[PDB]
Short mmCIF file of C-alpha atoms and ligand atoms in Angstrom, two decimals:
data_model
loop_
_atom_site.label_atom_id
_atom_site.label_comp_id
_atom_site.label_asym_id
_atom_site.label_seq_id
_atom_site.Cartn_x
_atom_site.Cartn_y
_atom_site.Cartn_z
CA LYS J 247 -0.04 -0.07 0.01
CA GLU J 248 1.41 3.34 -1.03
CA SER J 249 1.32 6.01 1.69
CA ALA J 250 -0.51 9.41 1.28
CA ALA J 251 2.86 11.24 0.89
CA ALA J 252 4.16 8.84 -1.75
CA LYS J 253 0.81 9.12 -3.74
CA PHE J 254 1.27 12.91 -3.68
CA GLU J 255 4.77 12.68 -5.05
CA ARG J 256 3.68 10.38 -7.81
CA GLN J 257 0.52 12.21 -8.87
CA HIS J 258 1.89 15.81 -8.46
CA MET J 259 5.67 16.13 -8.54
CA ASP J 260 7.62 16.60 -11.70
CA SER J 261 10.49 18.62 -10.49
CA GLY J 262 11.97 20.33 -13.52
CA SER J 263 4.77 20.02 -25.53
CA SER J 264 1.05 19.56 -25.95
CA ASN J 265 1.36 15.75 -25.28
CA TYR J 266 2.93 16.29 -21.83
CA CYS J 267 -0.12 15.41 -19.87
CA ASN J 268 -1.08 12.56 -22.24
CA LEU J 269 2.43 10.93 -21.47
CA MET J 270 2.48 11.79 -17.69
CA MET J 271 -1.01 10.97 -16.77
CA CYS J 272 -0.15 7.44 -18.24
CA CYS J 273 3.30 6.99 -16.85
CA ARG J 274 2.25 8.14 -13.21
CA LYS J 275 -0.67 5.68 -13.52
CA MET J 276 -3.60 8.09 -13.38
CA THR J 277 -5.22 6.35 -16.25
CA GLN J 278 -5.63 2.85 -14.90
CA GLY J 279 -9.12 1.86 -14.06
CA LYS J 280 -10.47 5.36 -15.17
CA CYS J 281 -9.15 8.51 -16.55
CA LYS J 282 -8.35 10.87 -13.55
CA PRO J 283 -10.26 13.95 -14.88
CA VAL J 284 -8.02 16.76 -13.59
CA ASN J 285 -4.51 16.77 -12.23
CA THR J 286 -1.74 19.21 -11.58
CA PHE J 287 1.98 18.57 -11.88
CA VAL J 288 4.51 20.99 -9.93
CA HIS J 289 7.88 21.64 -11.42
CA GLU J 290 9.54 23.11 -8.39
CA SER J 291 12.05 21.12 -6.25
CA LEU J 292 10.51 18.52 -3.74
CA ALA J 293 12.16 20.64 -1.05
CA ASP J 294 10.41 23.81 -2.13
CA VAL J 295 7.04 21.91 -2.28
CA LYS J 296 7.53 20.26 1.15
CA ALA J 297 8.32 23.81 2.50
CA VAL J 298 4.73 24.95 1.61
CA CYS J 299 3.61 22.81 4.66
CA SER J 300 5.22 25.61 6.81
CA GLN J 301 3.99 28.42 4.89
CA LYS J 302 0.56 30.06 4.81
CA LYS J 303 -2.28 28.22 6.51
CA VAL J 304 -5.67 28.29 4.67
CA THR J 305 -8.83 26.28 4.80
CA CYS J 306 -9.11 23.15 2.76
CA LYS J 307 -11.82 22.63 0.10
CA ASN J 308 -13.25 19.83 2.25
CA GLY J 309 -13.33 22.05 5.34
CA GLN J 310 -10.21 20.65 7.00
CA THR J 311 -7.54 23.25 8.37
CA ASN J 312 -4.48 21.22 7.57
CA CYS J 313 -3.93 23.19 4.20
CA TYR J 314 -1.24 25.54 3.24
CA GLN J 315 -0.73 27.98 0.50
CA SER J 316 2.62 28.55 -1.11
CA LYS J 317 4.16 32.05 -0.41
CA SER J 318 5.15 32.38 -4.07
CA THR J 319 3.74 31.26 -7.44
CA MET J 320 5.13 28.12 -8.64
CA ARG J 321 5.61 26.55 -12.16
CA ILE J 322 2.76 24.06 -12.70
CA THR J 323 0.88 22.28 -15.47
CA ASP J 324 -2.77 21.52 -15.35
CA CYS J 325 -3.97 18.39 -17.24
CA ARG J 326 -7.63 18.17 -17.98
CA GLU J 327 -9.59 15.29 -19.65
CA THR J 328 -10.69 16.51 -23.21
CA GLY J 329 -14.23 16.00 -24.43
CA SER J 330 -13.19 13.10 -26.72
CA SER J 331 -11.53 11.36 -23.81
CA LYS J 332 -13.00 7.81 -23.02
CA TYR J 333 -11.37 5.13 -20.94
CA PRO J 334 -9.25 3.29 -21.63
CA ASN J 335 -8.44 5.84 -24.34
CA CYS J 336 -7.78 8.74 -22.09
CA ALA J 337 -7.01 12.17 -23.55
CA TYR J 338 -5.77 15.31 -21.97
CA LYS J 339 -5.34 19.07 -22.54
CA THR J 340 -1.94 20.35 -21.21
CA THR J 341 -1.85 24.06 -19.81
CA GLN J 342 1.22 25.54 -18.14
CA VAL J 343 0.78 28.31 -15.73
CA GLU J 344 2.43 30.05 -12.72
CA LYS J 345 0.32 30.01 -9.82
CA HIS J 346 0.25 29.39 -5.96
CA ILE J 347 -0.51 25.94 -4.87
CA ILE J 348 -2.62 24.88 -1.85
CA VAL J 349 -1.73 21.54 -0.47
CA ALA J 350 -2.89 19.55 2.61
CA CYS J 351 -0.09 18.32 4.87
CA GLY J 352 0.05 15.48 7.29
CA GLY J 353 2.33 13.04 9.10
CA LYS J 354 5.52 13.50 11.30
CA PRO J 355 7.33 15.28 9.67
CA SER J 356 4.45 17.20 8.18
CA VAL J 357 4.51 16.75 4.49
CA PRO J 358 2.21 17.28 1.53
CA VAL J 359 -0.53 14.66 1.30
CA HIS J 360 -3.03 16.06 -1.07
CA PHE J 361 -3.01 18.70 -3.73
CA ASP J 362 -6.11 20.96 -2.92
CA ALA J 363 -5.93 23.81 -5.48
CA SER J 364 -4.07 26.34 -7.43
CA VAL J 365 -4.68 29.97 -6.88
O1 U3P E 593 -6.33 22.32 -9.21
C1 U3P E 593 -6.58 21.26 -8.84
C2 U3P E 593 -7.71 20.85 -8.02
C3 U3P E 593 -7.82 19.62 -7.83
N1 U3P E 593 -7.06 18.49 -8.17
C4 U3P E 593 -7.29 17.02 -7.95
O2 U3P E 593 -8.60 16.95 -8.41
C5 U3P E 593 -9.01 15.68 -7.64
C6 U3P E 593 -10.47 15.87 -7.20
O3 U3P E 593 -10.53 17.05 -6.19
C7 U3P E 593 -7.95 15.52 -6.51
O4 U3P E 593 -7.40 14.28 -6.63
P1 U3P E 593 -7.78 12.94 -5.84
O5 U3P E 593 -8.76 12.27 -6.63
O6 U3P E 593 -6.39 12.24 -5.80
O7 U3P E 593 -8.01 13.38 -4.46
C8 U3P E 593 -7.09 16.69 -6.49
O8 U3P E 593 -5.82 16.33 -6.17
C9 U3P E 593 -5.87 18.80 -8.95
O9 U3P E 593 -5.10 18.10 -9.21
N2 U3P E 593 -5.71 20.14 -9.24
N1 ADN E 594 -7.54 18.21 3.35
C1 ADN E 594 -7.03 16.77 3.02
N2 ADN E 594 -6.13 16.45 4.00
C2 ADN E 594 -5.45 15.26 3.77
N3 ADN E 594 -5.93 14.27 2.95
C3 ADN E 594 -6.93 14.74 2.12
C4 ADN E 594 -7.52 16.02 2.07
N4 ADN E 594 -8.44 16.19 1.08
C5 ADN E 594 -8.35 14.91 0.40
N5 ADN E 594 -7.39 14.02 1.10
C6 ADN E 594 -7.20 12.75 0.81
O1 ADN E 594 -5.87 12.63 0.15
C7 ADN E 594 -5.08 11.42 0.71
C8 ADN E 594 -4.30 10.70 -0.29
O2 ADN E 594 -3.47 9.83 0.24
C9 ADN E 594 -6.23 10.56 1.22
O3 ADN E 594 -5.67 9.89 2.51
C10 ADN E 594 -7.26 11.50 1.80
O4 ADN E 594 -6.93 11.99 3.11
#
């Protein structure tokens, strides 16, 4: 069983083309069983992302208060399923932007365990 922190790294970290999401959603296993409809990859170092856990506290979309917002914008890519997408033939629109990220943090040490939003 993969931990929440490991799942966060696999689905969201790509510390670092229109086919980017199509390749990544597949390699990171977000197209098995169903096409994950929306996902965000963060291109900052794992250290910079883990640091968000000690940055600005904000409320989580689900109501929890263990969420934090990055102090700076970060380079991210949003992958969104296209209308033509249909499992097992998933298809994604890739959009790069620079925005702040909001993540839920948990564990000891407190590390990201869920990508909540970009803002
Ligand atoms: O900007 C956003 C907002 C939400 N999500 C994702 O959308 C899914 C539904 O909220 C969540 O993934 P999960 O199914 O693993 O919990 C969350 O990570 C993103 O990737 N980016
Ligand atoms: N605010 C949140 N805090 C922690 N985990 C969350 C939150 N929203 C969704 N999740 C989920 O993401 C985790 C993925 O490992 C699940 O364990 C479940 O907690």
